[PDB]
């Protein structure tokens, strides 16, 4: 298309949401490295942040990046549909959350631990390192842990 | 494997023995000839018979052939 230049102000390896992110790649795919961030959520948000998807995560004035941040923990305020999110309706407060980065591992625990402390057949199934989804365990699951 | 069975060569045999006059070497004449002389219940069979009794003729003119 059109060759660009900028300066040394292109920066590789930027850290955000307590995770290091690769520059020098299309910014849409640099944000998926962050936990809870997939290819759809990185698409919709990068759009909703009014960021050039042709541009790499390298330059990305920090004002832009801080915009990109804000929407990821503020989905319903920037009008991302509410079907677009992983944690909906919760189990307690009843609200809808997109849990991201180190917080997805965090909240993942609680879900299991709930089921575990509840003495649920699926928590039983989880304590035993087994298949929770009801599939046949006979043949599959061999080389295992 | 194109080989005529016995029901084909026995027909062709007994046909030329009594019908050698008429029975020109040309197939299509002999084939049509067969319907008015010999009774055969198949389209193909009649053509298979014909084409062989044809062969008997075409060689016979170069001298006899056994049987």
């Amino acid at each position: 298309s059109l060759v660009v230049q900028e300066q040394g102000s292109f920066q590789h390896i930027l850290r955000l949401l307590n995770t290091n992110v690769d520059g020098n790649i299309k910014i849409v795919y640099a944000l998926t490295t962050i936990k809870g961030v997939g290819r759809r959520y990185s698409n919709l948000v990068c759009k909703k942040a009014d960021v050039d998807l042709h541009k790499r995560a390298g330059e990305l004035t920090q004002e832009e990046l801080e915009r990109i941040v804000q929407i990821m923990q503020n989905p319903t305020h920037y009008k991302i549909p509410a079907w677009f999110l992983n944690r909906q309706n919760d189990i307690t407060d009843g609200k809808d959350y997109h849990t991201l980065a180190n917080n997805v591992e965090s909240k993942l625990r609680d879900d299991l631990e709930r089921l575990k402390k509840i003495r649920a057949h699926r928590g039983i199934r989880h304590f035993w390192g087994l298949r929770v989804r009801g599939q046949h365990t006979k043949t599959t699951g061999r080389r295992r842990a | 494997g194109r080989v005529r069975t016995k029901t084909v060569k026995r027909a062709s045999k007994a046909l030329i023995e009594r019908y050698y006059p008429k029975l020109t070497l040309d197939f299509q004449t002999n084939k049509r000839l067969c319907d008015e002389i010999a009774t055969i219940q198949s389209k193909r069979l009649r053509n298979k018979i014909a084409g062989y009794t044809t062969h008997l003729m075409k060689r016979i003119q170069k001298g006899p052939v056994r049987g």
């Binding site: 003495r119 057949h121 928590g123 039983i124 035993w128 390192g129 295992r144 | -």
Partner: protein, 54 residues
Amino acid sequence: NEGAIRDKTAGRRNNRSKDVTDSATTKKSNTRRATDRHSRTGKTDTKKKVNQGW
């Protein structure tokens, strides 16, 4: 359910530490074969009996 989770001697890392029995890979057993034609019924219908019928 209360007993199920807490109980040790239960799990996957549990069973994965033990040894797979030899009868696992025992193959066929063939059952009765090559004895097929020799009649265990041990009757042998009789010359006069088989001519009276057939």
